Design a binder for this molecule. Structure first.
Ligand code: SF4
Ligand code: SF4
Lengths: 234, 234
């Protein structure tokens, strides 16, 4: 069934740069269980770190719960992303991960994986780079939350999704918003009605076409202009 | 002169868990050059990744420059912190690092270090945990920027500095703000006058004493209450 040797996201997931034998060795330890249902949690905050989770297909959201019980989303993960890097420093998950649609996950036992990386230097370096890239994306999200207005925040979110789907071999132009608009506003710090009005405006300028949960980008230059700008003085 | 064997922050820096021989091996590759002056940059965005930087003493700030030329700070680094993790994924620094006071830095050549970690599993695991902890702190900063008001943001910033200085063996009670208040507001998304009024209020409740750049915490319980709360409805 599911194996890394026959995976289209291998170049963006954990087996990147591994040759055939290294790839066989890596794939042996990975486990594929029943599909993750929508709303099902991969782990809860405080759970013992057992395995990392790669996303064969679907959408995952990472979030924490404030002292007052409010959910705050910290990341959306697409196919090829690895979830659970924040759990290594203390062998315990400090966050929640929840599927937003029916999703296939690859469970990678962390201690066995780390034992393997001590024997496969390419895998070690790829793990390093993936953690570094998560750090980089978190820094970019910090800049988004600090310097971008509502228009710029939503544009950056949409451009980021477009480029990631394009990296995963999908259409760079049309893609589905698998997360609710409430979750988008939670992640960007906006209201749902603010998101709806911004989408209306984006469609009015013909930059986007919105049809249900499907987004069509018609002017990537204008979208990237709004996404790479921080023009809000405040 | 400067060696990891005679370093008080060894348990919080990179040589953690290394025995005597492993520690000798690690220390051999690390280089100590002239001290970093205030305002001097360790690297610029786009510089080739040559070495990571550990902080033997002083204060560093990481920041990026927006398309409109504005600086946005993403982190402050104290003694024992490692700077340059975001540069691994592409062997190139995506950010700037600048000293806020006279600082001593340990230059760790990254390729030699990664070659060593392929031979010393404890060091490999410690590098993993440090990157994981940077991810965790970035997630916490995202939550700060998303859910906390000005009062809560400043309280969390001050409590975080207090706990980190306490981890480094310093006073948990009194500490110096080596970064300017403008840089604090940049990092937290606040105005300098907002910061000054918040400090006035914190001093009015006797929770803090402010004297120049020195902060004295008198009620850690109240400070942690404000720091761990996200009570702003908006
Ligand atoms: S998603 Fe699963 S099968 Fe595909 S490359 Fe990643 S670990 Fe391998
Ligand atoms: S600051 Fe320098 S000397 Fe001290 S533990 Fe870190 S690398 Fe070693």
């Amino acid at each position: 069934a599911i194996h890394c040797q026959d995976c289209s996201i291998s170049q963006h997931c954990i087996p990147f740069t591994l040759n055939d034998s290294e790839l066989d060795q890596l794939d042996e330890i990975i486990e594929r269980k029943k599909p993750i249902q929508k709303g099902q949690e991969l782990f809860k905050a405080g759970d013992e770190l057992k395995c990392l989770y790669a996303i064969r297909s679907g959408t995952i959201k990472s979030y924490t719960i404030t002292e007052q019980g409010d959910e705050q989303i910290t990341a959306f993960h697409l196919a090829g992303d690895l979830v659970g890097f924040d759990a290594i420093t203390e062998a315990q998950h400090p966050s929640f991960a929840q599927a937003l649609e029916t999703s296939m996950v690859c469970e990678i036992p962390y201690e066995i994986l780390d034992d393997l990386s001590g024997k496969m230097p390419k895998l070690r370096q790829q793990i390093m780079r993936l953690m570094s890239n998560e750090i980089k994306g978190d820094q970019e999200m910090i800049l988004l939350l600090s310097k971008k207005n509502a228009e710029e925040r939503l544009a950056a979110f949409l451009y980021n999704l477009s480029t990631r789907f394009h990296q995963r071999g999908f259409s760079p132009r049309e893609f589905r918003l698998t997360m609710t608009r409430g979750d988008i506003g939670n992640y960007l710090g906006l209201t749902v009605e603010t998101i709806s009005r911004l989408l209306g405006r984006f469609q009015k300028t013909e930059m986007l076409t919105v049809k249900g949960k499907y987004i069509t980008i018609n002017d990537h230059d204008a979208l990237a202009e709004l996404a790479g700008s921080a023009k809000e003085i405040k």
